[PDB]
Design a protein around this ligand. Sequence first.
Ligand code: CL
Lengths: 156, 156
Amino acid sequence: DDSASVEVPRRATPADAATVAQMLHDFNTEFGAPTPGTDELASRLSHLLAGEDVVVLLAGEPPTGLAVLSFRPNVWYPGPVAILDELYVRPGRRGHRLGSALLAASCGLVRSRGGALLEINVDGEDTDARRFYEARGFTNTEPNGTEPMLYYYREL
Amino acid sequence: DDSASVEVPRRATPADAATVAQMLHDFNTEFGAPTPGTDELASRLSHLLAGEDVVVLLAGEPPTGLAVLSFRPNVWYPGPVAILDELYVRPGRRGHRLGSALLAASCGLVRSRGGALLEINVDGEDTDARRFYEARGFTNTEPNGTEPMLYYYREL
Ligand SMILES: [Cl-]
C-alpha cells in the first residue's frame, strides 16, 4: 500500500505501435481534430518507435496519457533540439497530474540525449495549456525580449 | 543574351563548412547576437552538411546570404516537417531579394523531400520579418483561429 512510488512514464517500444495509434486517434476524434486511421498511424509508428527521432512516452497502466517528442540537430548546439510535438492527457485533475509527470519525464529524456532546449508551439487561445507550461519553466519571450515569439507556418 | 534573369541558390556541401561557419559567426557578431567560435561551428557543419537533417542554402557568388533548414519526422505526416531555422541576409533591397530567392528555394526543397509543412519561429517585435513571411504565404493563426500561435521554450 505504501510500497509503490508515483508512476514514472515509460518509453513506447515498437510493440506499442497499435496502442499508440489508437490513443492518438481517440484523443483527436474526441476533441474534433482530424486524424488518419489507425492502420496508417500504426504503420508509421512501427517505423518511428524503432528509431530515436520521434520518441513517445506513455503514462498509466493501461496507458491514458502520452507525450510525443521530436529531435533534430541545430547549427548552434552540440546536441539535438527537442520539440514537445504533443502532450495528450484527459481534461481534469487526473489528466493534469499525468501531464505534469509526462512533461518531467520528457525533460529528463531530452537531457539524456545531450539536449539543452525543449520547444513547444501553443495556440494563443489555449489559456489552460499556456498556464500549465508557464508554471513548469517555459517562456514565450526571451529575457531581453519585449513580446511573444510567434509560430508561423506555410502548407506546401 | 545568355544569362538567366535570376540566380538560383545552391546547396552548401561539406567543402563549404568553413565558409558557412564564417558567415554565421559574422552575421551574429555584426548584429550583436552571441555566437560560438568559427572552429566549433565549422566542425559541427562538417558533420551536418554531410547529412540531410540540417540543410544550408547559399545565395550569391561569393555567398552573401543563407538559409538553414531542419527536417524531422512527425506522427501525423508521411513526409518530414521542416523549420526555417535561420534566414540570414543583409538589410535593404539587396538582401530582401536574396531572402525571397532563398525562401522560394527552401519551399522547393522541402516539397522535393515530400514535406508538406514549413515552420518558422519569429520574434513578434520583428515587423519587417513578419511582413516578408506573410507576403509569401505564411500565417501565424490556424484557419478557424482567433489569435497568434506562440513559441515556448525551456532551457535544460
Ligand atoms: Cl484553454
